[PDB]
Scaffold this active site. Structure first.
Site, mmCIF file in Angstrom:
data_model
loop_
_atom_site.group_PDB
_atom_site.id
_atom_site.type_symbol
_atom_site.label_atom_id
_atom_site.label_comp_id
_atom_site.label_asym_id
_atom_site.label_seq_id
_atom_site.Cartn_x
_atom_site.Cartn_y
_atom_site.Cartn_z
ATOM 1 N N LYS A 56 51.376 32.265 33.072
ATOM 2 C CA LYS A 56 51.385 33.331 34.010
ATOM 3 C C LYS A 56 52.465 33.702 34.203
ATOM 4 O O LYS A 56 53.213 33.089 35.012
ATOM 5 C CB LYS A 56 50.590 32.754 35.392
ATOM 6 C CG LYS A 56 50.048 33.913 36.297
ATOM 7 C CD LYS A 56 49.266 33.357 37.455
ATOM 8 C CE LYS A 56 49.139 34.268 38.483
ATOM 9 N NZ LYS A 56 47.980 33.703 39.585
ATOM 10 N N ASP A 150 39.695 32.600 47.039
ATOM 11 C CA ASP A 150 39.716 33.335 45.832
ATOM 12 C C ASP A 150 38.407 32.832 44.819
ATOM 13 O O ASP A 150 38.649 32.759 43.650
ATOM 14 C CB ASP A 150 40.985 33.121 44.843
ATOM 15 C CG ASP A 150 41.482 34.416 44.358
ATOM 16 O OD1 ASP A 150 40.743 35.537 44.236
ATOM 17 O OD2 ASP A 150 42.572 34.505 43.700
ATOM 18 N N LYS A 152 35.079 33.029 42.780
ATOM 19 C CA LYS A 152 34.441 34.219 41.958
ATOM 20 C C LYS A 152 34.190 33.450 40.377
ATOM 21 O O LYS A 152 35.135 32.604 40.073
ATOM 22 C CB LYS A 152 34.907 35.371 42.054
ATOM 23 C CG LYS A 152 36.501 35.623 41.489
ATOM 24 C CD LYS A 152 37.214 36.876 41.538
ATOM 25 C CE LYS A 152 38.506 36.663 41.682
ATOM 26 N NZ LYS A 152 39.272 38.211 41.540
ATOM 27 N N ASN A 155 37.427 33.157 38.101
ATOM 28 C CA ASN A 155 38.453 31.975 38.513
ATOM 29 C C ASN A 155 38.017 30.880 37.941
ATOM 30 O O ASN A 155 38.736 29.875 38.120
ATOM 31 C CB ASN A 155 38.863 32.313 39.918
ATOM 32 C CG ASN A 155 39.738 33.419 40.128
ATOM 33 O OD1 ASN A 155 40.073 34.102 39.352
ATOM 34 N ND2 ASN A 155 40.188 33.624 41.230
ATOM 35 N N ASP A 168 43.562 30.822 39.718
ATOM 36 C CA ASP A 168 43.939 31.712 40.534
ATOM 37 C C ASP A 168 44.229 31.191 42.096
ATOM 38 O O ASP A 168 43.493 31.501 42.986
ATOM 39 C CB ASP A 168 43.198 32.955 40.634
ATOM 40 C CG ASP A 168 43.958 34.357 40.748
ATOM 41 O OD1 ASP A 168 45.041 34.272 41.397
ATOM 42 O OD2 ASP A 168 43.605 35.142 40.117
ATOM 43 N N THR A 185 37.858 39.084 47.178
ATOM 44 C CA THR A 185 37.126 40.246 46.175
ATOM 45 C C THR A 185 36.148 40.893 47.009
ATOM 46 O O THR A 185 35.295 39.909 47.561
ATOM 47 C CB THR A 185 36.848 39.461 44.891
ATOM 48 O OG1 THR A 185 37.952 39.409 44.088
ATOM 49 C CG2 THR A 185 35.908 40.372 43.925
HETATM 50 O O1 LIG Z 1 46.044 33.180 37.958
HETATM 51 C C1 LIG Z 1 45.407 33.674 37.019
HETATM 52 N N1 LIG Z 1 45.216 34.808 36.795
HETATM 53 C C2 LIG Z 1 45.450 36.027 37.687
HETATM 54 C C3 LIG Z 1 46.573 36.783 37.558
HETATM 55 C C4 LIG Z 1 47.745 36.645 36.499
HETATM 56 C C5 LIG Z 1 48.517 37.635 36.626
HETATM 57 C C6 LIG Z 1 48.812 38.807 37.323
HETATM 58 C C7 LIG Z 1 47.769 38.988 38.383
HETATM 59 C C8 LIG Z 1 46.777 38.214 38.621
HETATM 60 O O2 LIG Z 1 46.078 38.197 39.467
HETATM 61 C C9 LIG Z 1 45.933 39.518 40.146
HETATM 62 C C10 LIG Z 1 47.465 39.634 40.293
HETATM 63 O O3 LIG Z 1 47.873 39.949 39.334
HETATM 64 C C11 LIG Z 1 45.187 32.780 35.963
HETATM 65 C C12 LIG Z 1 43.819 32.995 35.279
HETATM 66 C C13 LIG Z 1 43.797 32.227 33.994
HETATM 67 C C14 LIG Z 1 44.474 31.403 33.700
HETATM 68 C C15 LIG Z 1 44.037 30.574 32.425
HETATM 69 C C16 LIG Z 1 44.193 28.886 32.684
HETATM 70 C C17 LIG Z 1 43.932 28.093 31.592
HETATM 71 N N2 LIG Z 1 43.416 28.576 30.348
HETATM 72 C C18 LIG Z 1 43.264 29.989 30.453
HETATM 73 C C19 LIG Z 1 43.900 30.693 31.586
HETATM 74 C C20 LIG Z 1 45.734 31.226 34.254
HETATM 75 C C21 LIG Z 1 46.040 31.942 35.277
#
Ligand SMILES: O=C(NCc1cccc2c1OCCO2)c1ccc(-c2ccncc2)cc1
Lengths: 334, 18
Positions: A56, A150, A152, A155, A168, A185
């Site tokens: 991330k 968070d 949903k 996530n 998340d 959300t």
């Molecule tokens: O926190 C996450 N995404 C949110 C996010 C990421 C970046 C910017 C954002 C944002 O949210 C709103 C603000 O702008 C996240 C989602 C999925 C995984 C993952 C884990 C394991 N395998 C595959 C994928 C890891 C992290």
């Protein structure tokens, strides 16, 4: 409980957080799995182990512009401290002049979202299988004085053993009392969040109610093309259930989606037990689900280590790191 | 049906946070 030994561990790590456990140069950037307002998520390969990870990337300036400085610090602090089977594993964390990075073990199965939309809806046994995972995770998080805020399908990630892995933690926070942030959300916001009141973990239990409905029905209990219209329905204290929803399901949900948070399940005297001991959860072996000994209804199609078929495609953009440090003071603890 | 009404809405995709 085992929960008391768990708080002992969380507290050790929370009071002394891990920082600078890696560098970008150690990771081989493969593909973009997801996007967002202040960064993206990438499929990275850690060259020394040959391991696959989700990375991330958070633009410090984009985090600052969106009043997200505290939320980010809460996210990493909680993620490096927690240990539960249904949570994402944060292996490494670091920052550079430009961004913030959180490297977590890759879940190639993707979001529950994708499968719930494609399939249409899950049978109550299949829905109950996941709900139990969230019910245990919330029990764990809540015991550590943590409010997730968070929940949903977007996530909840499906592992190859067919189990949940909650991502998340961007809204996760350690509150012993009341909190007031207007976040979440639209479809999942509890009535106390919309009505700008001081709220507690009862918001996490309401969110679950929404999730169980959407999993079982195929659509959320409150939807409208515009959020204002979505909120008007949530605060109205009216829910309709599909004809296939069982009596035990309908009752659970009517208790879970209780606008009067002083009569809402998971927020009473017995707390999490009113959920775990419900008629809908009579066929649930709470100990077998935690130990992953329960047979998963669906295992995702695995195409190898590094497959991204369960993630959508995004324009593979440029990771730029400025020659000047940005927002140092603000992200000091990270 | 409500499933038809949902599927025809602009709220079928990934929903972002407020
Ligand atoms: O926190 C996450 N995404 C949110 C996010 C990421 C970046 C910017 C954002 C944002 O949210 C709103 C603000 O702008 C996240 C989602 C999925 C995984 C993952 C884990 C394991 N395998 C595959 C994928 C890891 C992290």
């Amino acid at each position: 409980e085992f929960l008391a030994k768990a708080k002992e561990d969380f507290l050790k790590k929370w009071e002394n957080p891990a920082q600078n456990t890696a560098h970008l140069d150690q990771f081989e950037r493969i593909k973009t799995l997801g996007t967002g307002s202040f960064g993206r998520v990438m499929l990275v390969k850690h060259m020394e182990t040959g391991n696959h990870y989700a990375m991330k990337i958070l633009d410090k300036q984009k985090v600052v512009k969106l009043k997200q400085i505290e939320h980010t610090l809460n996210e990493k602090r909680i993620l490096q401290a927690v240990n539960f089977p249904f949570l994402v594993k944060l292996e490494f964390s670091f920052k550079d002049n430009s961004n913030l990075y959180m490297v977590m073990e890759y879940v190639p199965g993707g979001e529950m979202f994708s499968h719930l939309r494609r399939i249409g809806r899950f049978s109550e046994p299949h829905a109950r299988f996941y709900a139990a995972q969230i019910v245990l995770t919330f029990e764990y998080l809540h015991s550590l004085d943590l409010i997730y805020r968070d929940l949903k399908p977007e996530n909840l990630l499906i592992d190859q053993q067919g189990y949940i892995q909650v991502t998340d933690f961007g809204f996760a926070k350690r509150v012993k009392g009341r909190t007031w942030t207007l976040c979440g959300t639209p479809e999942y916001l509890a009535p106390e969040i919309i009505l700008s009141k001081g709220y507690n973990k009862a918001v996490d239990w309401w969110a679950l109610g929404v999730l169980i409905y959407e999993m079982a029905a195929g659509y959320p209990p409150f939807f409208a093309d515009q959020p204002i219209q979505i909120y008007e329905k949530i605060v109205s204290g009216k829910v309709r259930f599909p004809s296939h929803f069982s009596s035990d399901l309908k009752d659970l949900l009517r208790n879970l989606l209780q606008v009067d948070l002083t009569k809402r399940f998971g927020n009473l005297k017995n707390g999490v037990n009113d959920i775990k001991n419900h008629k809908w959860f009579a066929t649930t072996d709470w100990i077998a689900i935690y130990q992953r000994k329960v047979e998963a209804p669906f295992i995702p199609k695995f195409k190898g280590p590094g497959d991204t078929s369960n993630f959508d495609d995004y324009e593979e953009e440029e990771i730029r790191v400025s020659i000047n440090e940005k927002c140092g003071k603000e992200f000091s603890e990270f | 049906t409500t499933y038809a009404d949902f599927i025809a809405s602009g709220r079928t995709g990934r929903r972002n946070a407020i």
